[model samples]
Target: GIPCGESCVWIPCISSAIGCSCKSKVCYRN
Candidate 1:
């Protein structure tokens, strides 16, 4: 199982066909 915190955020992606993409927001703590 994953121990660290995980996060995701939607951002602009002109190269993507969907016009958007999902990226990790970054985890600050476990």
Candidate 2:
């Protein structure tokens, strides 16, 4: 699912090799 950018983190997330974000700034994949 699409999480809020700069708002939260997601697991099975994007690694240093795979992450996604938005204009909010730092996207999360935790």
Candidate 3:
């Protein structure tokens, strides 16, 4: 789980027939 005020979360759902792009990024700064 991500923190309340200092984190971000990304979730992706892909279809089995059409396929999808498997890419992601996460950035953190203080």
TM-score of each: 0.17, 0.20, 0.18
Cα-based lDDT at residue 1, candidate 3: 29
Worst 10 residues of 2 by lDDT: 7-16
Between prediction 1 and prediction 2, which has the larger lDDT?
2
lDDT of 1 by residue, 1-30 (tens): 232333334333333443233345432221
After superposition on all C-alphas, the RMSD of every candidate to the true structure, in Å, is 9.3, 7.3, 11.0
Query: Model 3: runs farther than 4 Å from truth?
Result: 1-15, 25-30
Instruction: Give lDDT per model, in order.
Output: 0.35, 0.43, 0.31
The CA-based lDDT of model 1 is what?
0.35
lDDT of 1 at 24: 51
**Most TM-score-accurate candidate:** 2
- Clashes counted in candidate 3 amount to 0
Clashing pairs for model 2 are 10-30, 11-30
The positional error of residue 6 in candidate 3, measured at the CA in angstroms, is 23
Clashes of each: 0, 2, 0
